[PDB]
Amino acid sequence: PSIWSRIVNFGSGWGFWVSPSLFITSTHVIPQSAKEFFGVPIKQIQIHKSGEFCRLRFPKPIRTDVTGMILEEGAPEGTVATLLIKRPTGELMPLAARMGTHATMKIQGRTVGGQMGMLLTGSNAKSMDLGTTPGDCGCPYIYKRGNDYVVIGVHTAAARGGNTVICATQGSEGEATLE
Amino acid sequence: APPSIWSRIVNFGSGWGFWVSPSLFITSTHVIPQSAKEFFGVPIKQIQIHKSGEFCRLRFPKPIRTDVTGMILEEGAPEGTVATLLIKRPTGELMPLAARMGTHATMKIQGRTVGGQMGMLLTGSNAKSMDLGTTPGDCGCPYIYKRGNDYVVIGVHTAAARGGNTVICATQGSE
């Protein structure tokens, strides 16, 4: 099956099926108060919210047609990852983005954390087919390792110019404390 | 890309074609049905067929697509322009692929000599990819970009290089 089949509507945004039981999305697109997800009661779902990242594990497999997939935390700096954007009009937009350091961004009255990236379309990211839109939150960032696909996070925010984007990852890594 | 631009893209032979005006139809010479005798119900004798490299222009005697207007056609695009390859798939999906346009050149692809304006896909993946790139049978899809407030077509897809993000856009002229 196609990889785009793993990207489904969820709340006000999108979500990605990493496996028949694992489903990742952005936190600010989840329904604020719901009773069930994909026919499963909320109490029977293992839900982990780490910053803007959100993961859902189900007690029984849901999407039995997809296979397991690698979910790393970010990508090496300089990697040209791909954001897979789905629009409600039916279009599929693979947008390339060079990934940089992890960072926080001041947006609205708050701050949003994740790995920073810059789209390769440059200033042309103001166009609708060359950049992101707030409705694309939850769409996945992936890149190819060998002959396999690796998802590193989901779209959560973009800067005022639209060129710089933020990828929500499983969590930030602090430096160790030895002995 | 409004729904009108997408409606101008139609199936044609081995690939796709683009209605520039109600009477003009551009496509790639690679996807032409060679053993045909009628295009859109019109015999071949009545249609002006002009081939510039892999680019193919068809001028019909009577208007065929009366629902479309006339849009601008450019003999290539300025270097560095970020255009959009509008791919339609038989699954019904729409796939706009961003591509940075470069210089005109000629390559040898699968034993065929193909000339045109070269571009590089900004999709992160190689130009030959089912889920993220182009496939055989995507030829004829147009390259579109917005100059000021006019959507213009610079050419049609005719070839994708193996092992890289390079694509060839057949244009009507070198300038």
Residue numbers in the entry:
A (entry chain A): 3 to 181
B (entry chain B): 1 to 175
Please give sentences taken from the publication describing this entry.
Sydney 2012 unliganded protease crystallised in space group C2221 with four chains in the asymmetric unit. The electron density quality was consistent with a 2.79 Å structure with continuous density for each protein chain, some missing residues at the N- and C-terminus, and with several side chains omitted from the model due to weak density. In the ligand-free protease crystal structure, we observed two distinct conformations for Arg112 in the Sydney 2012 GII.4 protease. In three chains (Chains B, C, D), the guanidino group of Arg112 is oriented towards the active site and interacts with Glu54. As noted in earlier reports, Arg112 in this closed conformation likely prevents the unprotonated imidazole nitrogen of His30 from being positioned optimally to deprotonate Cys139 for nucleophilic attack. Arg112 also occupies the middle of the active site cleft and may sterically hinder the entrance of substrate. In contrast to the closed conformation observed in chains B–D, one chain (chain A) adopts an alternative conformation, whereby Arg112 does not interact with the catalytic triad but faces away from the catalytic centre. In this orientation, the Arg 112 side chain is involved in a crystal contact that includes residues Ala127, Lys128, Ser129, and Thr134 from an adjacent chain. The movement of Arg112 out of the active site makes Glu54 more available to interact with His30, which is oriented toward Cys139 for deprotonation, promoting an active state. The unliganded protease was solved with one chain in the open conformation and three in the closed, indicating that there is enough flexibility in this region of the structure for the active conformation to be available for the subunits in the GII.
